[PDB]
Amino acid sequence: ETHINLKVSDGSSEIFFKIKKTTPLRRLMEAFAKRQGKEMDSLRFLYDGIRIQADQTPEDLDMEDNDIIEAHREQIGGLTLAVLLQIAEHWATRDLRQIEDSKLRALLTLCAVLTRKFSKSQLGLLCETHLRHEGLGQDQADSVLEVYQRLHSDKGGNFEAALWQQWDRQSLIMFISAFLNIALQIPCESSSVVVSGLATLYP
Amino acid sequence: GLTLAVLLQIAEHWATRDLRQIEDSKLRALLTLCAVLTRKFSKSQLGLLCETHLRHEGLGQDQADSVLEVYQRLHSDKGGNFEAALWQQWDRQSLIMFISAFLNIALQIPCESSSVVVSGLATLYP
């Protein structure tokens, strides 16, 4: 047999291929990614638990007829919530007048990402706590809520970008620093009987 | 005070717990915990979560749509609506299994994927 049948699967979508044993696996990888509407490089492919490369052949790998290749989504970066909270806690105490624009831009992103980890129903408390942290008054409530609300729903990253272009540095610094302090102390869901249920799970 | 930090502490503790004898009220609360934590992932991460969950559990293709739907509907949930329906509709073993798999895979998966986001935040690690 100069040919081999192989299945590529990601657990949901599976595809039954046939190729020649001396042909690189690239074309199968490309056809599978294409069917998920993805770029080949957004996926990785494993055989017998081992990542394999597009230039390798079923022959080099001692594949057997009807063997299975697993398609796995790439894990790009390691930004767990745990890691984001470490970053926030580190920067919360820092004087930001010092830092490069590149770090400030990234901190803006951190505030936007972390804002989106609060339920909608907490944005009011987040606003009110922001005001009390800064010593601002009800005069500013609408403007602060609108920032948080717009970040919370900022799907394109477009509002975040506008904030970076339109706000002066001192204003950005004041807001970012306010947020990083209050965000770690405020509950991420509102009260309810169901959320009180979580109390029974505390160690 | 269910802070982000406290949410993760609860999840970390319960990922290590044997649920053989789990009480109904505790199971109900674990469902809430999983629903809340699911919503800390960006929508773009749901596919990776589902994929990891299928593989962790040895679930077939036949069950892929179903596990994904649960993830999508927890993620888009409002006022505990879908969560409450899951509690009523699913048998106890199925819920336990789902919750136990979630807690064992969720804590190592990034909560954001965007190239824009990962690139930016890299610079901020101590």
Numbering used by the authors:
A (entry chain B): -77 to 125
B (entry chain A): 0 to 125
What does the study report here?
Four proteins are essential for viral transcription: nucleoprotein (NP), VP30, VP35 and the RNA-dependent RNA polymerase (L). VP30 allows the polymerase to read beyond a cis-RNA element in the NP mRNA 5′ untranslated region and to re-initiate transcription at gene junctions. A basic cluster in the C-terminal domain (CTD) contributes to the association of VP30 with NP and is essential for transcription activation.
Here, we present the crystal structure of the VP30 CTD from Reston ebolavirus. The two copies of RESTV VP30 in the asymmetric unit are nearly identical in structure and superimpose with an r.m.s.d. of 0.76 Å. One of the Smt domains helps facilitate crystal-packing interactions, whereas the second Smt domain is disordered. The fold of RESTV VP30 CTD is helical and closely resembles that of EBOV VP30, with an r.m.s.d. of 1.15–2.14 Å separating the Cα backbones of the EBOV and RESTV structures. Reston VP30 and Ebola VP30 both form homodimers, but the dimeric interfaces are rotated relative to each other, suggesting subtle inherent differences or flexibility in the dimeric interface. Dimerization in both EBOV and RESTV VP30 is also facilitated by similar hydrophobic interactions between the globular domains and a conserved hydrogen bond between the side chain of Lys180 in helix 2 and the main chain of Cys251 in the linker between helices 6 and 7. The occlusion of Arg179 and Lys180 in the RESTV dimer interface suggests that mutations at these positions could disrupt VP30 dimerization. While we are unable to rule out the influence of the Smt on the conformation of the RESTV dimer, the observation of two dimer conformations in the available structures suggests that there may be inherent differences between the African and Asian viral species.
